[PDB]
Amino acid sequence: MSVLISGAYGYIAKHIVRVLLEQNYKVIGTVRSQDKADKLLKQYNNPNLSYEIVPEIANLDAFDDIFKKHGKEIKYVIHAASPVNFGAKDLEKDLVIPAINGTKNMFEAIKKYAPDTVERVVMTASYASIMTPHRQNDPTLTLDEETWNPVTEENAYENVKTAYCASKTFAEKEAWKFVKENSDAVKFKLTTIHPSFVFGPQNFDEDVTKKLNETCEIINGLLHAPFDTKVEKTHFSQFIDVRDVAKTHVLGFQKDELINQRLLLCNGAFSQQDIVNVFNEDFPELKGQFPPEDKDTDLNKGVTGCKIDNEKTKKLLAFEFTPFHKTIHDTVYQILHKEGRV
Numbered sequence: 303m304s305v306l307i308s309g310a311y312g313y314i315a316k317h318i319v320r321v322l323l324e325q326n327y328k329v330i331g332t333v334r335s336q337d338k339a340d341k342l343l344k345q346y347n348n349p350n351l352s353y354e355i356v357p358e359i360a361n362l363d364a365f366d367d368i369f370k371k372h373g374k375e376i377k378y379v380i381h382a383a384s385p386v387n388f389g390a391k392d393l394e395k396d397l398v399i400p401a402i403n404g405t406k407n408m409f410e411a412i413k414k415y416a417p418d419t420v421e422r423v424v425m426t427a428s429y430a431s432i433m434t435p436h437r438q439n440d441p442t443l444t445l446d447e448e449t450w451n452p453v454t455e456e457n458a459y460e461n462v463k464t465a466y467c468a469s470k471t472f473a474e475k476e477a478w479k480f481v482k483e484n485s486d487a488v489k490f491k492l493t494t495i496h497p498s499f500v501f502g503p504q505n506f507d508e509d510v511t512k513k514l515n516e517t518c519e520i521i522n523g524l525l526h527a528p529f530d531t532k533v534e535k536t537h538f539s540q541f542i543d544v545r546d547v548a549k550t551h552v553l554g555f556q557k558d559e560l561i562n563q564r565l566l567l568c569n570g571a572f573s574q575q576d577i578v579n580v581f582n583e584d585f586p587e588l589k590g591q592f593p594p595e596d597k598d599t600d601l602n603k604g605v606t607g608c609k610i611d612n613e614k615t616k617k618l619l620a621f622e623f624t625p626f627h628k629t630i631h632d633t634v635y636q637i638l639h640k641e642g643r644v
């Protein structure tokens with residue numbers, strides 16, 4: 303009854319671990335270095351948490367050692383290890399190759415040393431593998447759990463955005479491809495999770511550094527921005543609270559009803575200005591120390607870009623997602639409070 307979570311130092315994966323432990327599960331995280339396999343254990347301070355070193359997921363057979371060792375004992379797997387880099391220079395090396403090869407390694411590992419044992423896999427695909435990047439501002443497009451990013455190998459490296467989305471997309475295709483080809487040879491049942499822009503507070507207060515993980519850095523940067531910086535008030539994308547994501551991943555391997563599902567996690571359209579208004583609304587005493595409040599935003603006009611039909615998702619999961627106002631507030635409070643401003 304053990305749970306392997308890959309990429310366990312991750313913003314999201316650290317909430318997943320929190321939840322796994324809350325429910326008294328034996329967790330095996332994977333991390334890049336020993337440096338980090340130490341930092342985490344001290345934070346969690348839990349006898350059920352163990353770690354295995356996987357420095358590079360793209361490398362040959364990257365997960366085979368974990369399954370020689372802990373082979374008999376891993377029943378559920380949460381593959382959450384994929385690169386997230388918005389400034390990546392080597393697009394194939396930095397994004398696509400690890401996304402794909404990391405996933406083939408994880409899966410081919412489960413084929414080789416634990417075909418019969420591993421009951422469930424929960425993969426962290428993305429809103430990126432469902433949306434059409436360049437058509438986010440097109441309200442005639444509706445996205446649901448059967449929608450795919452039509453990006454092809456040939457036009458995927460247009461820029462860094464189209465690259466990291468393609469990476470999530472192609473990795474996913476490989477997963478499903480795998481499942482269909484080997485459904486007779488391996489027992490596990492795949493479930494993929496598709497979060498949009500994940501915001502929310504860092505699982506540990508100490509992890510509030512000068513520069514956060516990629517998506518929360520959006521908020522962090524804005525909060526420390528000089529007063530008269532230009533803030534984009536046009537619609538940007540969808541969000542979903544990290545806490546909602548965590549819960550969802552664990553449910554992923556628990557509930558029978560979530561087998562073979564693509565779970566689409568959005569809960570609100572937002573702009574940069576819409577985030578900045580939460581600064582000014584919830585912490586009025588700090589007016590002047592970040593950009594100002596402006597209501598005329600695409601959100602308040604009623605402009606939300608493309609439509610999200612995630613009703614099947616919401617029904618299946620059962621729980622209510624966290625409102626934007628809460629998610630931004632909690633993210634912000636944690637930082638300002640760590641800094642001693644409130």
Ligand SMILES: NC(=O)c1ccc[n+]([C@@H]2O[C@H](COP(=O)([O-])OP(=O)(O)OC[C@H]3O[C@@H](n4cnc5c(N)ncnc54)[C@H](OP(=O)(O)O)[C@@H]3O)[C@@H](O)[C@H]2O)c1
Pocket residue numbers: 308309310311312313314315333334356357358359360381382383384385386400404426427428429470496497498499500501515516517
């Ligand atoms: N952030 C979001 O809003 C968002 C939205 C949709 C989906 N996701 C997905 O959620 C998962 C976690 O993302 P995150 O937002 O938590 O970012 P994150 O903090 O970078 O989490 C990713 C973790 O995986 C590790 N990692 C990356 N590449 C690796 C490699 N080649 N080998 C071994 N470990 C590697 C990272 O370690 P290093 O930092 O040491 O590289 C990090 O600890 C990813 O699968 C991502 O695609 C995230």
